[PDB]
Amino acid sequence: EPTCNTPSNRACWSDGFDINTDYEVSTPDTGVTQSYVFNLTEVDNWMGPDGVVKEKVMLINGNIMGPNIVANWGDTVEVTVINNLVTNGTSIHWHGIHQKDTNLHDGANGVTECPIPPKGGQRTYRWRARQYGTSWYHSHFSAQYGNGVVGTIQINGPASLPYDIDLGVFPITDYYYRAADDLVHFTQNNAPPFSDNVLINGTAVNPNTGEGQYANVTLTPGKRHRLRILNTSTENHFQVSLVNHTMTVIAADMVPVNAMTVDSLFLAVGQRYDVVIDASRAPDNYWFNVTFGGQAACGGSLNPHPAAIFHYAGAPGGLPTDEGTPPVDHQCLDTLDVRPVVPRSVPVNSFVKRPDNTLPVALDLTGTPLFVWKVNGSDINVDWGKPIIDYILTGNTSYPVSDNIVQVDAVDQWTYWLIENDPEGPFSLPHPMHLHGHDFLVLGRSPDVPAASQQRFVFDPAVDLARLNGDNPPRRDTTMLPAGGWLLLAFRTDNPGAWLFHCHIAWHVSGGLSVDFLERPADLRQRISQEDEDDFNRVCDEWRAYWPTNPYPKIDSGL
């Protein structure tokens, strides 16, 4: 753990480990393990934080969110998940945790494991904390995490800027009264709805009844505070800001970045931002605002002004008085100005669009249901009863077309992927793309234009090769795919396994927007221990025995 990490020197951690250490290839071994136990229950007619009683929710240990995972850079995190839901199977994915050589602990049901059966099923996840920062976890059993199976992850380590207080996690999520399975069914033939409310750190005031309450953050006058903001929504994409205050980003997702002071921030579904706010203003109460932009192209809420209160220690304690000015419209796009502390460099002068490096996203309105998302001609649909890893363990290469298997044999090399966002269809929407097992490099994207303008673009070397940047570009696990445009990413094949690459909007991945990167399959088998294998077969045997008795059918892709 830490020894030299002080308020005025956060760059220091322990001998041989600091903010400049390449955390991707060097990990401190503390020999320490942090354990947790997740009890999943299905609660009917549960009263929410704003006053409304939801029809049904799924909770980890009876709370709106699971427990905050907390550990030090280099420790081992272990979580026993006991599934006490009535019918649903379940899987907990650790969003942001690359799972280096531990693919079978990724929590991607139908891909790296069968779901943990209901009514008592259990399985223990175990992974090493090889990266420090802020992340989160959630179910991957369809849109289940929309009912409550979600929580945060805080792995301590160095920082690119000194600060006095670490305020901790600050999850911002959209909140719907209807249940995930109902919304999934609804979104298969209807446009997605606005969120009934937006929760800031678990709470919110009902805009109709006045019930509920504002999240209350207390700043220590004169001190610099670290705030870890996350967006754990199923659809809503946010914009945040603090009246009369700026924010200095020091981390994008779980990647530390050079200090970048901003006025507001756009956070896509699944993104995080570690910021340092300085209590240098007059003691008072200020509004922390959540606003939307991009003309509803990436979300909207029925609560016109979701917000929290930042109270200065010592000032009166009422509601803030200054409503402030609306932040700039970020047009459903994240900033590409972030520069990671630990650099990366990849050539882009030699890129060339090809069928095997291009992933065309399309919306198919000709079949059933109405809204079906496809990538390279197919809507993904995994088999909960026979994940891809089972094929790997049985020398079976007959992968069904539905699994959208994109095999990458390259050994520890940079791979380039151009994702095209339905440039030829009726209409295109912004899509937050996310990759399991790695942090990709955002080499570039189509020109920034209003998200609703419906302008289209198609990669054109004559103009775009000049727009690409491979000189330490933003590195992270989630970034925005411009509406009607394209996006060029890159990730190094340093981690054998089956990795999902999907859109994090629940409604979409559910509808099929996803592929499965089968990375270095030949090296994969040799690296799966007898234990992960046996337990894999164990959980799969229990799930296969259960399924036939399930009273419900699988309605979507299962992801």
Ligand X SMILES: *[C@@H]1O[C@H](CO)[C@@H](O[C@@H]2O[C@H](CO)[C@@H](O[C@@H]3O[C@H](CO)[C@@H](O)[C@H](O)[C@@H]3O)[C@H](O)[C@H]2NC(C)=O)[C@H](O)[C@H]1NC(C)=O
Ligand Y SMILES: *[C@@H]1O[C@H](CO)[C@@H](O[C@@H]2O[C@H](CO)[C@@H](O[C@@H]3O[C@H](CO[C@H]4O[C@H](CO[C@@H]5O[C@H](CO)[C@@H](O)[C@H](O)[C@@H]5O)[C@@H](O)[C@H](O[C@H]5O[C@H](CO)[C@@H](O)[C@H](O)[C@@H]5O)[C@@H]4O)[C@@H](O)[C@H](O[C@H]4O[C@H](CO)[C@@H](O)[C@H](O)[C@@H]4O)[C@@H]3O)[C@H](O)[C@H]2NC(C)=O)[C@H](O)[C@H]1NC(C)=O
Ligand Z SMILES: *[C@@H]1O[C@H](CO)[C@@H](O[C@@H]2O[C@H](CO)[C@@H](O[C@@H]3O[C@H](CO)[C@@H](O)[C@H](O[C@H]4O[C@H](CO)[C@@H](O)[C@H](O)[C@@H]4O[C@H]4O[C@H](CO)[C@@H](O)[C@H](O)[C@@H]4O)[C@@H]3O)[C@H](O)[C@H]2NC(C)=O)[C@H](O)[C@H]1NC(C)=O
Ligand U SMILES: *[C@@H]1O[C@H](CO)[C@@H](O[C@@H]2O[C@H](CO)[C@@H](O)[C@H](O)[C@H]2NC(C)=O)[C@H](O)[C@H]1NC(C)=O
**Among 340, 379, 401, residue whose Cα is nearest residue 20:** 340
- If one asks whether residue 323 binds ligand Z (CB under 6 A), the answer comes out as yes
Pattern 295-314, binding to ligand X, x per CB under 6 A?
--------------x-x-xx
Q: Is the peptide bond before 369 cis (omega within 30 degrees of 0)?
A: yes
Helical (H) or strand (E) element with 198 = strand 197-200
Instruction: Out of 359, 505, 518, 539, point to the residue binding Cu ion (CB under 5 A).
Output: 505
Q: 140 a known binding residue?
A: yes
Which range of residues in 166-174, 231-239, 291-299, 534-542 is near ligand NAG by CB under 6 A?
166-174
Applying CB under 6 A, which of residues 218, 358, 455, 472 lies at the interface with ligand X?
Answer: 218
185 is in an annotated binding site: no
How far apart (Å, rounded) are the C-alpha atoms in residues 374 and 512?
6
Judged by beta carbon, residue 225 or residue 431, the one nearer ligand U is 431
User: What's the CA gap between 291 and 200, in Å, rounded?
Assistant: 12
Nearest-angstrom CA–CA distance, 355 and 17 = 42
Residue 291 binds which of ligand Z, ligand U, ligand NAG, none (CB < 5-8 A, kind-dependent): ligand Z
Give the one residue of 7, 326, 347, 461 binding ligand Z; rule: CB under 6 A.
326
Q: Show the site string, 44-63: x = touches ligand NAG by CB under 6 A, - = not.
A: ------------------x-
Interface positions, 14-73, toward ligand Y (CB under 6 A): 55-56
Question: Could you say whether residue 80 binds ligand NAG (CB under 6 A)?
Answer: no
Q: For residues 63 and 314, give the distance between their C-alpha atoms in angstroms, rounded to a whole number.
A: 31
For 250, residues 6+ apart whose C-beta sits below 8 A from its C-beta are: 159, 160, 161, 226, 256, 257, 259, 274, 275, 276
137/286 with CB nearer ligand Z: 286
Q: Contact at 8 Å (CB) between 451 and 297?
A: yes
DSSP lists the bridge partners of residue 161 as none
34, 162, 185, 399: residue in contact with ligand Y (rule CB under 6 A): 185
Strands (E), 253-357: 255-262, 265-267, 272-278, 285-291, 307-312
Contact letters for Cu ion, residues 79-108 (x by CB under 5 A): ----------------x-------------
The alpha helices in 135-259, defined as continuous H runs, are 180-186
Please choose which of ligand NAG, ligand Z, ligand X, none residue 311 contacts, taking the beta carbon within 5 to 8 angstroms, the exact cut-off set by kind: ligand X
What is d(CA 369, CA 366) in angstroms, rounded to the nearest whole number?
A: 9
Region at 106 (left for phi over 0; alpha for psi -120 to 50; beta for the rest): alpha
Q: Which is nearer to ligand U, 216 or 376 (CB)?
A: 376
The window from 131-139, 185-193, 286-294, 501-509 that contacts ligand Z (CB under 6 A) reads 286-294
Q: Which stretch binds ligand U (CB under 6 A): 15-23, 121-129, 390-398, 455-463?
A: 390-398
Q: Is 503 annotated as a binding residue?
A: yes
Q: Which of residues 398-437 bind ligand U (CB under 6 A)?
A: 398, 400, 406
Task: Name the phi and psi angles at 177, rounded to 5.
Answer: -80, -35
Pick one of 4, 122, 162, 186: the residue that binds ligand Y (CB under 6 A). Answer: 186
Residue 504 assigned ligand-binding role: yes
Helix (H, G, I), strand (E, B) or coil at 32: coil
In the list ligand X, ligand Z, ligand U, none, the entry touching 398 (Cβ below 5 to 8 angstroms by class) is ligand U
376 sits near ligand U (criterion: CB under 6 A): yes
CB of residue 86 to ligand NAG, shortest distance in Å = 12
Q: Does 167 bind ligand NAG (CB under 6 A)?
A: yes
User: Please, what is the minimum distance in Å from the beta carbon of residue 306 to ligand Z?
Assistant: 7
**CA–CA–CA angle 277, 281, 287 (5° rounding):** 70
- Answer yes or no: are the C-beta atoms of 349 and 467 closer than 8 Å: no
What are the structure tokens assigned to 152, written together? 């945060």
Site string for ligand Z, 298-317 (x = CB under 6 A): -------x-x----------
Question: Are the beta carbons of 437 and 461 closer than 8 angstroms?
Answer: no
505 binds, among ligand X, Cu ion, ligand U, none (CB under 5 to 8 A by kind): Cu ion
Of 419, 409, 394, the C-alpha closest to 480 is 419
Which listed option, ligand X, ligand Z, ligand Y, none, makes contact with residue 52 (CB within 5 to 8 Å by class)? none
Which CA distances in Å does 93 have to 11, 108, 183, 408, 551?
Answer: 30, 6, 21, 22, 25
Give the 3-state secondary structure of residue 252.
strand
Closest residue by Cα to residue 410 from 249, 299, 306, 518: 518
Consecutive H or E run containing 509: helix 506-511
Per the DSSP assignment, residues forming a β-bridge with 301 are: 195
Of the pair 239, 331, the CB lying nearest ligand Z is at 239
Taking the complex as a whole, how short is the minimal distance between the CB of residue 137 and Cu ion, in angstroms? 8
d(CA 231, CA 354): 34
Neighbours of 84 (CB within 10 A): 16
Question: Are 112 and 497 in contact, with CB atoms under 8 Å apart?
Answer: yes
Residue 62 interacting partner from ligand Y, Cl ion, ligand NAG, none (CB closer than 5 to 8 Å by kind) = ligand NAG
Query: Which span (174-182, 216-224, 263-271, 417-425) binds ligand Y, by CB under 6 A?
Result: 174-182
When asked if residue 216 is in the footprint of ligand X (CB under 6 A), the reply is yes
Restricting to residues 423-442, name those near Cl ion by CB under 5 A. 436
Q: Which residues are annotated as a binding site?
A: 93, 95, 138, 140, 431, 434, 436, 502-504, 508
Q: Which residues are annotated as a binding site for Cu cation?
A: 93, 95, 138, 140, 431, 434, 436, 502-504, 508
The footprint of ligand Y (CB under 6 A) covers 55-56, 87-88, 179, 181-182, 185-186, 189-190, 550, 552, 554-555
The footprint of ligand Z (CB under 6 A) covers 287, 289, 291, 305, 307, 319, 323-326
